[PDB]
mmCIF file of C-alpha atoms and ligand atoms in Angstrom:
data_model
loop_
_atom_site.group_PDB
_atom_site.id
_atom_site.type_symbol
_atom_site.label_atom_id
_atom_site.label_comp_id
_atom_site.label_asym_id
_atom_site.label_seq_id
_atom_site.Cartn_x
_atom_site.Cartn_y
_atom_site.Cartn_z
ATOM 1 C CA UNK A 1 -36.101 111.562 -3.032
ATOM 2 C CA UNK A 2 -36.673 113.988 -6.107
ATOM 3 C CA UNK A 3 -38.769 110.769 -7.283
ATOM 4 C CA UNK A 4 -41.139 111.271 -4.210
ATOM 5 C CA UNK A 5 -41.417 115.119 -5.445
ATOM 6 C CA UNK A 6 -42.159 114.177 -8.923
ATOM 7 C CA UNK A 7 -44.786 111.765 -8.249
ATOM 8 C CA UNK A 8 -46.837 113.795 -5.550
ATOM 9 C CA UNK A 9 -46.771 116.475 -7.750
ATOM 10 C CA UNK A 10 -47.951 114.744 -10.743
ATOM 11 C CA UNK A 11 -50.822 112.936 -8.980
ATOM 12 C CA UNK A 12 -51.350 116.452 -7.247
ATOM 13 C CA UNK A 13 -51.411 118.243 -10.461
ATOM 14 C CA UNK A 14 -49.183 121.539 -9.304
ATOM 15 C CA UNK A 15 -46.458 122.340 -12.241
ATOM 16 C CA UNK A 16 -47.590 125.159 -12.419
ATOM 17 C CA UNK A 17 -47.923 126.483 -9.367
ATOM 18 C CA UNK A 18 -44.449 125.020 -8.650
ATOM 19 C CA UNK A 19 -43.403 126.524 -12.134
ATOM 20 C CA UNK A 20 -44.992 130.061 -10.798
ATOM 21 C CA UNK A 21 -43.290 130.077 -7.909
ATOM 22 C CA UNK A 22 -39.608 129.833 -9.414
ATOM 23 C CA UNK A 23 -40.891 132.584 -11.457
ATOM 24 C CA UNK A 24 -41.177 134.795 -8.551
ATOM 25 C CA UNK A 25 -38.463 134.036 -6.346
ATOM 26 C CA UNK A 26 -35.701 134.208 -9.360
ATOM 27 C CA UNK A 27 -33.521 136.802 -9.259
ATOM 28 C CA UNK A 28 -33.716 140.439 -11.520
ATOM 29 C CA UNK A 29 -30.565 142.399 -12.272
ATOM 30 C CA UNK A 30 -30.097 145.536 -15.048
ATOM 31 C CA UNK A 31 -30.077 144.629 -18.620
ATOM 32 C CA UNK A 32 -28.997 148.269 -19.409
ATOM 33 C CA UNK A 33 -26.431 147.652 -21.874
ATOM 34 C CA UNK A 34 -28.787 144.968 -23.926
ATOM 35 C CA UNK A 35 -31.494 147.639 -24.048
ATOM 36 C CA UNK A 36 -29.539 150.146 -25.375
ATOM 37 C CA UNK A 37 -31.244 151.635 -28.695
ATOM 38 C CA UNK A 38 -28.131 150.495 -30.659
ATOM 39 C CA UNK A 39 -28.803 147.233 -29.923
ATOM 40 C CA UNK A 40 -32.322 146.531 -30.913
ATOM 41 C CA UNK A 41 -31.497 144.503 -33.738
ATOM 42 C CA UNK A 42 -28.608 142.233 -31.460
ATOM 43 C CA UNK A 43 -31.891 140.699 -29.996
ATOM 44 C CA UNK A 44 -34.226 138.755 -30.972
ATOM 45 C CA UNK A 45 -36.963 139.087 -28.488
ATOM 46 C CA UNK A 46 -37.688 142.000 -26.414
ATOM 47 C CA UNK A 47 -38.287 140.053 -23.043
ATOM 48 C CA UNK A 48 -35.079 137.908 -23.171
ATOM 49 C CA UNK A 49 -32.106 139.816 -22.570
ATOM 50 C CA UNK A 50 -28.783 139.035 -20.472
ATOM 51 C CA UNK A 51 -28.138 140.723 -17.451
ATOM 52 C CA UNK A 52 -25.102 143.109 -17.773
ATOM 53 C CA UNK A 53 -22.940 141.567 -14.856
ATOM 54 C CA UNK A 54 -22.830 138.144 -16.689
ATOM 55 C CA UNK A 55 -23.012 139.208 -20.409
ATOM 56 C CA UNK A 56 -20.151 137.799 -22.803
ATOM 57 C CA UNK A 57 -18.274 141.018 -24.146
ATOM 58 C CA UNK A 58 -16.954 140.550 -27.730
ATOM 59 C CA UNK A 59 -13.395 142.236 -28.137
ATOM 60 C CA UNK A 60 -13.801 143.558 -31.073
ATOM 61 C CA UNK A 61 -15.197 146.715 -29.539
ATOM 62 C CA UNK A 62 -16.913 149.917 -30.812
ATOM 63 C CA UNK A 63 -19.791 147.615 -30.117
ATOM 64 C CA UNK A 64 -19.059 144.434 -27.876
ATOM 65 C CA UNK A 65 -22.646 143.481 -27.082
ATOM 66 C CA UNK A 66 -23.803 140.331 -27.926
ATOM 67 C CA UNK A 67 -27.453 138.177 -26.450
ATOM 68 C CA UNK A 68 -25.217 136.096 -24.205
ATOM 69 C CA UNK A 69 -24.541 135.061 -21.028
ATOM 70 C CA UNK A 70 -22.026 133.127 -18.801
ATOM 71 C CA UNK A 71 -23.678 130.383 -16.216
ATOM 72 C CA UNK A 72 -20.908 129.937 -14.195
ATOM 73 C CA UNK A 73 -21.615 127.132 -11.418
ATOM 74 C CA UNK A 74 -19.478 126.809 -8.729
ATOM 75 C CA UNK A 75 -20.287 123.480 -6.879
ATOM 76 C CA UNK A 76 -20.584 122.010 -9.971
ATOM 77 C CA UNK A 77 -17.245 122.889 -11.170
ATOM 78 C CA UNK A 78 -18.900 123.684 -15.061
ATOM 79 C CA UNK A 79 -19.653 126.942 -16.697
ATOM 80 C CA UNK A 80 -21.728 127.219 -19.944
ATOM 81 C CA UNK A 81 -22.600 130.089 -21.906
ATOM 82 C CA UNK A 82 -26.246 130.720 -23.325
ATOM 83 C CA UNK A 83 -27.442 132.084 -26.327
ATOM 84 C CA UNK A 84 -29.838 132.734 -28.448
ATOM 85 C CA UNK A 85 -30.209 131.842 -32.001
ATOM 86 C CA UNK A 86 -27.960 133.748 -34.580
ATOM 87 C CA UNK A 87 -29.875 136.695 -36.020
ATOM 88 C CA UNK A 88 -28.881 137.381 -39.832
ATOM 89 C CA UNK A 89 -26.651 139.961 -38.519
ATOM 90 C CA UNK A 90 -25.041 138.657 -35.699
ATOM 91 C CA UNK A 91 -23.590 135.462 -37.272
ATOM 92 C CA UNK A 92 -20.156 136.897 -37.166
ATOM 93 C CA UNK A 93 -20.412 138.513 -33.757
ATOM 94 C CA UNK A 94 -21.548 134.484 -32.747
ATOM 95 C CA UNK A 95 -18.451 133.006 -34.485
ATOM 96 C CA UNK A 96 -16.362 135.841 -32.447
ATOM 97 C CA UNK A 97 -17.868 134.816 -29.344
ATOM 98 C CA UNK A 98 -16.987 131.416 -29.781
ATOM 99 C CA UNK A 99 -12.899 132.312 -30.763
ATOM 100 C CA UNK A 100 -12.261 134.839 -27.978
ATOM 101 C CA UNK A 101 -13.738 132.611 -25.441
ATOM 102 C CA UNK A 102 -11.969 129.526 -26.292
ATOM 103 C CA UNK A 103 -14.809 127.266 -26.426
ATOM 104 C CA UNK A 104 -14.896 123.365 -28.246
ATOM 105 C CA UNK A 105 -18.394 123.179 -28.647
ATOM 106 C CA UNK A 106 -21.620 124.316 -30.171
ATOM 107 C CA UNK A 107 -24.698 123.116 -28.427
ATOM 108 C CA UNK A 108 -27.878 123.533 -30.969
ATOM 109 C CA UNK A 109 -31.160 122.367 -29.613
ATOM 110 C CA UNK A 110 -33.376 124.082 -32.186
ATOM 111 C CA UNK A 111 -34.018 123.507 -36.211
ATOM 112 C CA UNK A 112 -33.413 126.783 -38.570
ATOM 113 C CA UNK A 113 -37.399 126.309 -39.404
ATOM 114 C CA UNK A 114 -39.763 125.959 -36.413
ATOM 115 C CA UNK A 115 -44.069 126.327 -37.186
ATOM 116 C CA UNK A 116 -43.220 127.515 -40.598
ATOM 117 C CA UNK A 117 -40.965 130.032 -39.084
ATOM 118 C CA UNK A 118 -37.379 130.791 -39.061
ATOM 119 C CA UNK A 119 -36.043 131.043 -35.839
ATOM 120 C CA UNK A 120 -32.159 130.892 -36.452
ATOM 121 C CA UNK A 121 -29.987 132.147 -39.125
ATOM 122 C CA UNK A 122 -27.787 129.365 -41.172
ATOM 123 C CA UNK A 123 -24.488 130.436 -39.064
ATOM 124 C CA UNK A 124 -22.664 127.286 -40.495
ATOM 125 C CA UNK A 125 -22.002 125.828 -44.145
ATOM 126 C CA UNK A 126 -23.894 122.962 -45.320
ATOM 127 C CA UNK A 127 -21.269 121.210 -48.337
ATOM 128 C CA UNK A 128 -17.436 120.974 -47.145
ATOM 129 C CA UNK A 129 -16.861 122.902 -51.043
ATOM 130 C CA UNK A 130 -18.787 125.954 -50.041
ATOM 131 C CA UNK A 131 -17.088 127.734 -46.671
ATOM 132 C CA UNK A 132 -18.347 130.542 -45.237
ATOM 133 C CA UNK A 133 -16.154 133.890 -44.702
ATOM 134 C CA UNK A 134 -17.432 136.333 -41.493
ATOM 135 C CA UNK A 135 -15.863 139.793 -43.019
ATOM 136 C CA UNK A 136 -17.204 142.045 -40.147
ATOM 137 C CA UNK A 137 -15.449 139.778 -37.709
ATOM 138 C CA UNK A 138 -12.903 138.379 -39.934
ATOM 139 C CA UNK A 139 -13.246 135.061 -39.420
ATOM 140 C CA UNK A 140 -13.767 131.624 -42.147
ATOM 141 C CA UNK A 141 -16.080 128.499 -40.965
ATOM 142 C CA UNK A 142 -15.781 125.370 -43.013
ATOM 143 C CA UNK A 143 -17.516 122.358 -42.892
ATOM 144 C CA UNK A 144 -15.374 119.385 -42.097
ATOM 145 C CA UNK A 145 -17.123 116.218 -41.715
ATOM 146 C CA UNK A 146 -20.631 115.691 -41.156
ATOM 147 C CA UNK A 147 -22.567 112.826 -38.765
ATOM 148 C CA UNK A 148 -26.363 112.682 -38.954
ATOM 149 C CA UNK A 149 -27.964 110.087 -36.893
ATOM 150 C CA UNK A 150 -31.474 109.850 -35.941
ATOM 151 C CA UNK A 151 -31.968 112.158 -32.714
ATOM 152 C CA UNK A 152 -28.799 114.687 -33.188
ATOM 153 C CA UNK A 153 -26.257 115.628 -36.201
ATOM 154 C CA UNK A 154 -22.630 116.338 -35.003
ATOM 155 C CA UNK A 155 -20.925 118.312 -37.669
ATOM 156 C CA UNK A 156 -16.536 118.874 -37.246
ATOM 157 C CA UNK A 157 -15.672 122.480 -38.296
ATOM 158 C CA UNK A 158 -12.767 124.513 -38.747
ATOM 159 C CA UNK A 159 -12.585 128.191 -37.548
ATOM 160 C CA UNK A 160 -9.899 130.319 -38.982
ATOM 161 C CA UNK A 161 -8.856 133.763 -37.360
ATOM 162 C CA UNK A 162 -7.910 135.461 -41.187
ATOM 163 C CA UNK A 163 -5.943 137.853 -39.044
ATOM 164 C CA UNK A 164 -3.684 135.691 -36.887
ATOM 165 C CA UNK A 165 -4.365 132.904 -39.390
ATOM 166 C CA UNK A 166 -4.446 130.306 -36.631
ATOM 167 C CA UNK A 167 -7.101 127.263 -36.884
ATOM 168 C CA UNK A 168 -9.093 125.443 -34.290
ATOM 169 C CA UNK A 169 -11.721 122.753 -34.699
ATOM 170 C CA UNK A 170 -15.566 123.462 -33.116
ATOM 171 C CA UNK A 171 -17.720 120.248 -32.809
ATOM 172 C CA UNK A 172 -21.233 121.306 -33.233
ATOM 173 C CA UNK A 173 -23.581 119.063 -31.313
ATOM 174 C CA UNK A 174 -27.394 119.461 -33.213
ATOM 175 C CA UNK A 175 -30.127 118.065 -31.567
ATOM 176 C CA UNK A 176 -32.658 117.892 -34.289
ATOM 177 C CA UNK A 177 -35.704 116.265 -32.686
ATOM 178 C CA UNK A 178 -37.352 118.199 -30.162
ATOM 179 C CA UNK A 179 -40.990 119.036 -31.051
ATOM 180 C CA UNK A 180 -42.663 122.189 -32.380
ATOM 181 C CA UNK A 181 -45.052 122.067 -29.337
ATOM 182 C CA UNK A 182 -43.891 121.445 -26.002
ATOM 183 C CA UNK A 183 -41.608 118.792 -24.303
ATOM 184 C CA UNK A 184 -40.655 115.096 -25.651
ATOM 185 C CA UNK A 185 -41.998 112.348 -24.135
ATOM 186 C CA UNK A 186 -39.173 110.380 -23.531
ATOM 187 C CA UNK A 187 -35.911 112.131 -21.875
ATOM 188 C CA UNK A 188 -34.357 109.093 -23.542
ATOM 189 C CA UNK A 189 -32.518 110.432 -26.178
ATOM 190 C CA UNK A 190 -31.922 114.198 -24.808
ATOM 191 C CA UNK A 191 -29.470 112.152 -22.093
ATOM 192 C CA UNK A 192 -27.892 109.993 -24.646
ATOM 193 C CA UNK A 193 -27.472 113.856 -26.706
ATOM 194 C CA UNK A 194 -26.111 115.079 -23.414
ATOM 195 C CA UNK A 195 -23.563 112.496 -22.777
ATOM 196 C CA UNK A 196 -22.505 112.701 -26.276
ATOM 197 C CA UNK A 197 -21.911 116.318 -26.129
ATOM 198 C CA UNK A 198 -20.252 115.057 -22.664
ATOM 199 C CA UNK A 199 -17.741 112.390 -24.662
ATOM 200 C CA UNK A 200 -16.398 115.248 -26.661
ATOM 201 C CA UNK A 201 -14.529 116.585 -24.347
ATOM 202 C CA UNK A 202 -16.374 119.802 -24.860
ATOM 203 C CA UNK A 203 -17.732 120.358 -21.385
ATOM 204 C CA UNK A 204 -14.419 120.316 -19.911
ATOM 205 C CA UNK A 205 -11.865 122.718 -18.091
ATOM 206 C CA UNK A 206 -9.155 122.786 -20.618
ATOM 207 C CA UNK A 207 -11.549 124.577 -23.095
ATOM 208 C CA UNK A 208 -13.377 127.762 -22.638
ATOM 209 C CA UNK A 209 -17.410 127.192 -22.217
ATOM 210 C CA UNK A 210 -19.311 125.215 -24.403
ATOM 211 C CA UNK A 211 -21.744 127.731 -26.402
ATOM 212 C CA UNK A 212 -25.500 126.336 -25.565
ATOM 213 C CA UNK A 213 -28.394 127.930 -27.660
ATOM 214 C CA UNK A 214 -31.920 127.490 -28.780
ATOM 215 C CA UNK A 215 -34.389 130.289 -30.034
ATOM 216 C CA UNK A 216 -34.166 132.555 -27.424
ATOM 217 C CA UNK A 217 -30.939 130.738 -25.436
ATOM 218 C CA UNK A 218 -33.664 130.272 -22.388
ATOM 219 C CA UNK A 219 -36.084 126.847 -22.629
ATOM 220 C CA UNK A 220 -34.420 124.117 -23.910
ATOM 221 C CA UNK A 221 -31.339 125.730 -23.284
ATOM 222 C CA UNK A 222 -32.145 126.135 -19.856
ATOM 223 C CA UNK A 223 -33.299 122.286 -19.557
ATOM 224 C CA UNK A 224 -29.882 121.176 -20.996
ATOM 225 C CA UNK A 225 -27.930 122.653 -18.760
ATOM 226 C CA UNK A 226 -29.493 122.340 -15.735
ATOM 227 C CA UNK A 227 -30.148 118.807 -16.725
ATOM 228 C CA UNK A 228 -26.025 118.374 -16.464
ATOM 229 C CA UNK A 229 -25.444 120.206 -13.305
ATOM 230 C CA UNK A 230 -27.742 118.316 -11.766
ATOM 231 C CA UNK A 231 -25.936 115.185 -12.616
ATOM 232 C CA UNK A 232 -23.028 115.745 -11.838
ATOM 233 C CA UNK A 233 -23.756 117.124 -8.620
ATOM 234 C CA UNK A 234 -25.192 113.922 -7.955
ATOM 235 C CA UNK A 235 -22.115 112.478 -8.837
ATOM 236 C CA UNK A 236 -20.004 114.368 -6.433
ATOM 237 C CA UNK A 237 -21.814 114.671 -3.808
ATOM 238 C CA UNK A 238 -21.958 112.777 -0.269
ATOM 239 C CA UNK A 239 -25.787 111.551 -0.007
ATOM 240 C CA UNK A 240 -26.980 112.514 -4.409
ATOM 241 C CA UNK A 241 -30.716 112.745 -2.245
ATOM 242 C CA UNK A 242 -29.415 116.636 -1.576
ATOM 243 C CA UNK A 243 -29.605 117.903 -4.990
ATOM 244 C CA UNK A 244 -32.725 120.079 -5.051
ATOM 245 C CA UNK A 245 -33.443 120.926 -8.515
ATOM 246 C CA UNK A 246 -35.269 124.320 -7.924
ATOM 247 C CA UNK A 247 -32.749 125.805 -6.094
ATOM 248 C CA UNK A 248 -30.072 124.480 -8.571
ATOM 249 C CA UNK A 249 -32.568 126.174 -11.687
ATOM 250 C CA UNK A 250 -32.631 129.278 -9.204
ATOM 251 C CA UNK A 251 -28.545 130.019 -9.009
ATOM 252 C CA UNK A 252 -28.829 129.532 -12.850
ATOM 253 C CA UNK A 253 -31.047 132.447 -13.419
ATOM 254 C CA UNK A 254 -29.129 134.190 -10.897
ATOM 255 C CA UNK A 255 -26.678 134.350 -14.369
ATOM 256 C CA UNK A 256 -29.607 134.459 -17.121
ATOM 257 C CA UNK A 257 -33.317 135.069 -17.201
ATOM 258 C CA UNK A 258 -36.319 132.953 -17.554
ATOM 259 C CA UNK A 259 -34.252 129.401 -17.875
ATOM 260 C CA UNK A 260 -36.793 126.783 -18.325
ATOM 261 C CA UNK A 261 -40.131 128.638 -20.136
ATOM 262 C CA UNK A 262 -43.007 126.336 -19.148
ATOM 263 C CA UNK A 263 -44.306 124.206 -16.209
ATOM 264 C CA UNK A 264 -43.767 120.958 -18.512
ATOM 265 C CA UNK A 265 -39.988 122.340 -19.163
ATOM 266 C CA UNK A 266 -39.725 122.237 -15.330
ATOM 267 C CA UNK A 267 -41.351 118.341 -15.558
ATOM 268 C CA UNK A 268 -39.248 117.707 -18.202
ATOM 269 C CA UNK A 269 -35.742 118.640 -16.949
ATOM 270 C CA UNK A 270 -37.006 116.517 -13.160
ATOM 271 C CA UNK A 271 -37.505 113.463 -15.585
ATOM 272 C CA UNK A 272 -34.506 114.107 -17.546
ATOM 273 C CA UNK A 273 -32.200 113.931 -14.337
ATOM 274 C CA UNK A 274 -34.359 111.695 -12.237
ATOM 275 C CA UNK A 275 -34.181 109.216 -15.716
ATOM 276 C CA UNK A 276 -30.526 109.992 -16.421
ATOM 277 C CA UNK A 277 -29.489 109.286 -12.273
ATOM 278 C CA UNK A 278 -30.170 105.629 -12.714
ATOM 279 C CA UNK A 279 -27.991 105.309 -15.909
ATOM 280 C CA UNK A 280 -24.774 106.423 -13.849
ATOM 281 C CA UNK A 281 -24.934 103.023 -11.419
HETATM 282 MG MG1 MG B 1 -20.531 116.375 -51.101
#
């Protein structure tokens, strides 16, 4: 199955109508706190917002709101959070995210410049000699080791609380090939990014969630993580035929809106899994 899907609906020509569909029956919830005036400039688009029962709270109050969310999957047995790109102003309020919740891992599935445009601050130093210091949140990033290969970059850093002057290392996974416009051809080497990220360590229970963004924390974002649910449901299950993808993408945005943006996001993530089912054998 799931192949059979794929295949009548690519010689039937209906992503989007299949796409629509998952549009409509997703869930809505209140975004009050997001759309507060305060935070305008927290976001940075006016139609992607998370909904205030999963939103990640910073600590740090007086203002705790950050353009996050927690996908927390219970079959699955894996929670991620999702977020969007870094606005200039919200680098620090990223990097406190990332302490108070414990997580190992940075997922990045976007470049800084996108179609001439920037769509993501530089939240992390670029020469081991020049750190950056948060002073808002209090916090110090530097740039320990640095592995560019052809598809992804994974980069070691070293988070300092200045305050309780403990240290912790973040691997920051960068997947640096995706296209300006729309979906790669190959799923190819998004699963050999996704079982890298895997190999870490950094999707598993002894850390807090791994931190998963793009621009807006939605598309690609979306297609990663769904991408590794559905895997490893496949994995655990009794009869891996039972995994329906749509209703897996569904209980997602139960948690965040508007996962997966496009109809060839939707044929994308099917590949992905469908592809990335036959390498676990
Ligand atoms: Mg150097």
């Amino acid at each position: 199955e799931m192949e059979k899907e794929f295949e009548q609906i690519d010689k039937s020509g209906s992503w989007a109508a299949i796409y629509q569909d998952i549009r409509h029956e997703a869930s809505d919830f209140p975004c009050r706190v997001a759309k507060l005036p305060k935070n305008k400039n927290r976001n940075r688009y006016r139609d992607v917002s998370p909904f205030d029962h999963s939103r990640i709270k910073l600590h740090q109050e007086d203002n705790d709101y950050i353009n996050a969310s927690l996908i927390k999957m219970e079959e699955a047995q894996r929670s991620y959070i999702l977020t969007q790109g870094p606005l200039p102003n919200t680098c620090g309020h990223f990097w406190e995210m990332v302490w108070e919740q414990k997580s190992r891992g940075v997922v990045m599935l976007n470049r800084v410049m996108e179609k001439g445009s920037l769509k993501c601050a530089q939240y992390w130093p670029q020469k081991e000699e020049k750190e950056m210091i948060y002073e808002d949140t209090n916090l110090k990033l530097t740039l320990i080791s640095e592995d560019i290969k052809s598809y992804y970059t994974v980069r070691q850093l070293e988070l300092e609380n200045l305050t309780t002057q403990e240290t912790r290392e973040i691997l920051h996974f960068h997947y640096t090939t995706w296209p300006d416009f729309g979906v790669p051809e190959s799923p190819a080497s998004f699963l050999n990014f996704l079982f890298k990220v895997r190999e870490s360590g950094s999707l598993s229970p002894e850390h807090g969630p791994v931190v998963v963004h793009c621009s807006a924390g939605i598309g690609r974002s979306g297609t990663f993580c769904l991408a590794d649910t559905c895997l490893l449901l496949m994995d655990k299950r009794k009869d891996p035929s039972s995994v329906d993808i749509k209703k897996v993408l569904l209980e997602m945005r139960k948690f965040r809106m508007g996962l997966i943006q496009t109809a060839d996001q939707l044929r994308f993530s099917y590949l992905a899994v469908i592809e990335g089912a036959k390498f676990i054998m």
